[PDB]
Design a protein around this nucleic acid. Structure first.
Lengths: 109, 71, 113
RNA sequence: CGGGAAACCAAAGUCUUUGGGUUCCGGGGGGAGUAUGGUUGCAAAGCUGAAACUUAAAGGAAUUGACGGAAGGGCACCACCAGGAGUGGAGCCUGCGGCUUAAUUUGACCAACACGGGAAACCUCACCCGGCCCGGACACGGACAGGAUUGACAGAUUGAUAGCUCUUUCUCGAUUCUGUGGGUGGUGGUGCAUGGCCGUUCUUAGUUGGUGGAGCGAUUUGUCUGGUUAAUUCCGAUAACGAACGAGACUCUGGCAUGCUAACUAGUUACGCGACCCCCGAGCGGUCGGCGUCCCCCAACUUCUUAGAGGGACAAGUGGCGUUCAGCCACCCGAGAUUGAGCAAUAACAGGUCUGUGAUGCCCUUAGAUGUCGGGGCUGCACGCGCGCUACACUGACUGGCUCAGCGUGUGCCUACCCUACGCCGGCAGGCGCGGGUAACCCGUUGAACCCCAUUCGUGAUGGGGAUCGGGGAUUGCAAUUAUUCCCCAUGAACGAGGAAUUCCCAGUAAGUGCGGGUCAUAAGCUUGCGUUGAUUAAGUCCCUGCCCUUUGUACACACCGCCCG
RNA sequence: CCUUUAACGAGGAUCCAUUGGAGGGCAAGUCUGGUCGCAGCAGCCGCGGUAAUUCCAGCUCCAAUAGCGUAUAUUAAAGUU
């Protein structure tokens, strides 16, 4: 935002930086395809399978996930088409992961 | 602030080896006491303690900064 | 807290005092803080009389959940005389101490002494 | 009258004490006047009229707040007008962001940003990289007097002269070590768990209960139509009456004493003077007069200086004006009813502070330690912003000469340290020898700057400006490199009055100018106080920005930085 | 089968009472451990974002009781036909 107010009643902040789970079992890296409204959003997984991603509590209006960029997504235990967002990263964090050679080397930022 | 990261050495205090004790006085016949190396000559030393038989080095361990003969 | 604050209050009022005040700031009935004022009588807050006619104390008291602040403020009553401790004039509105006498029965006469 | 949820209504009255006659019509909010079939119409459409599915609110009246590009009053140089000086432009200092880095520690975004006393060499220090130490209480068990255990030379190793480690072999003696249980430390985290403190709303005039009155109640009256004041300040009105907090009163400071009190740790005057000095003036040089110093007292005094007790100013008097009330304006006397500060209500803020606190909850960490030594960093730059400093010359610079001040402070303290006169040496920084000061006593009759008086330069990026940069000399310290500070010579940049914007100020005030204190081993371009020189402009207003009171409107109450539509 | 009668047949450890609930409506925990807007609970109002009186468990307590819970039709509550 551009300053304003009423934005201090509540817990500043910030990311004192930090670090770094993965993947886990059904809990992996994806890239934002589109940017729907209402709340949900689209995101193609890095493996090759598409899926539709869903936001998670807290991260609601506490973290904006602009279009295009890596993001951490849990897969639903039983559901294929819909999947559940976790834990986003940083663009710097995503290029460090790419340099390490753990996610596939296909997408640009 | 954050937790300690792994070393690849650390060792604290040496165990100060578990030597057999008093063989410093030698008995071959009585009442004679066969002393080996000289007992320490300082005024502040009691001269009841032995000096080290440490040849090419000759040092009172009661002293801790002084009185080191070496020949 | 309430019954304790009342009990101390009436004693300091009974012993003599224009008025008196108690504050308890800190937690109770949950993990957000509040404040609890218990007040009776007169009080002053401004001017130089604050140095004479009130005394004020602060004491911290612990509990298993945080700290509670006690503060007590009490107003001294003497104005007629003695010890003399605090000065005789009234503090906030400084009163005009007014004696009265008023008689005459005079008529002319000469009275020799 | 009576009714009504209230607004209101002689009807919307005569209703749980329910019934005069009769017609039409309603059943949470949407879906929807849509779908569908019927009917009427030339057309446009009218009348008649569902469900599936969805949702816990939609809606009415009234009250209290907030808000209004609503209305009426009042107020502020953090608002304006009238103006003064600047900032923004240039160079430099410093704080902040971004970037870099092994680390470039961290809080804070009108009410952060020369702020955290935060001008960091080490220390500080929270950061980064190496090394060492335990200062792990206490309990229980184990070990254990040919013994638990302690320390160390040299050599090797090491930044290291850390027995840290290893080689080597003496020394210490129940203090311990080892295991388990349990503590302890932390500038570790959480100011959205808290105490305390501070800032801000808010420098305005606001605020509350009792008893009575008015309402089903939330609430309201008291706290006001009007006049008046800087002010909820008074006068007056009056279903309210009598009170409380803030305002004021109060404290400190300035301005008025030839009145009072009393002074070799304060002065003045008077001689006594004797001494020096020049006739400089009458006279002769003496004396009389003039210049300061020594001499001064058992002299006289307290005007000056010092600090105590008191007095003085009240809208007091006069003239206007006002209800003739409360007050307001002018004038005499004179110090005019305002010299400047301190103290300051109710309620609130998810404001700041866990890095002031042996204040503190909970969580974390605790021997390979977040508790100690050595080194590095907080100063690293293609950039953005803030507070300031110095400048752009002649109302000046430069070199001589003259002449005036105040608030303070000072060794005997923290652990090693003060302020300096005088003598000597050096261009200077400085060195060295002696002496005083617990301080109205010594430094210091604080012999300061701007200013004042006389030379030189001449409209020239000049001799204005002093940035950048080379070499050399001193001082502080254990250590001065990324230059601690100071001095000498040389080098000589931007800058020739500054866009869009914007800050602050009304009388010893603005501006110019120096000094003391704070931090301090060495060192203010900062902050806090003090003197000196000393204007122009206003005596107003609600235009902008904002604030107080009333009235009004509201779909707002997370309160317009609101809510809400396709 | 029932009633009637021999003989065996009770020391609480077993000759074993369960079904729901404990934030409010509504009788009963601002107890302890785990989870941390996740998993779940919740007729309704609402609980969970690391200090959960509502979740998952333990202990304790409350209601009814050889019965108690849940779904659906329907009446009373409804002067909301």
């Amino acid at each position: 935002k551009g300053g304003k107010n009423r934005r201090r009643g509540k817990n500043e902040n910030e990311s004192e930086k930090r670090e770094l789970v993965f993947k886990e079992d059904g809990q992996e890296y994806a890239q934002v395809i589109k940017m729907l409204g209402n709340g949900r959003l689209e995101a193609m997984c890095f493996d090759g399978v598409k899926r539709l991603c869903h936001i998670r509590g807290k991260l609601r209006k506490k973290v904006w996930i602009n279009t295009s960029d890596i993001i951490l997504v849990g897969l639903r235990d039983y559901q294929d088409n819909k999947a559940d967002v976790i834990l986003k990263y940083n663009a710097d964090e995503a290029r460090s992961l790419k340099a390490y050679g753990e996610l596939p080397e296909h997408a640009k930022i | 602030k954050k937790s300690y990261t792994t070393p690849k050495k650390n060792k604290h205090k040496r165990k100060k080896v578990k030597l057999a004790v008093l063989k410093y006085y030698k008995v071959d016949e009585n009442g004679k006491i066969s002393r080996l190396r000289r007992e320490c000559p300082s005024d502040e030393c009691g001269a009841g303690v032995f000096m080290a038989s440490h040849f090419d080095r000759h040092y009172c361990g009661k002293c801790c900064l002084t009185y080191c003969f070496n020949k | 807290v309430r019954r304790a604050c009342y009990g101390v209050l009436r004693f300091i009022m009974e012993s003599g005092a224009k008025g008196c005040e108690v504050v308890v700031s800190g937690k109770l009935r949950g993990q957000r803080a509040k404040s609890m004022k218990f007040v009776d009588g007169l009080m002053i807050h401004s001017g130089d009389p604050v140095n004479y006619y009130v005394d004020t104390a602060v004491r911290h008291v612990l509990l298993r959940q945080g700290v509670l602040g006690i503060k007590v403020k009490i107003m001294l009553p003497w104005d007629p005389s003695g010890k003399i401790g605090p000065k005789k004039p009234l503090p906030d509105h400084v009163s005009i101490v007014e004696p009265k006498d008023e008689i005459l029965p005079t008529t002319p006469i000469s009275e020799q002494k």
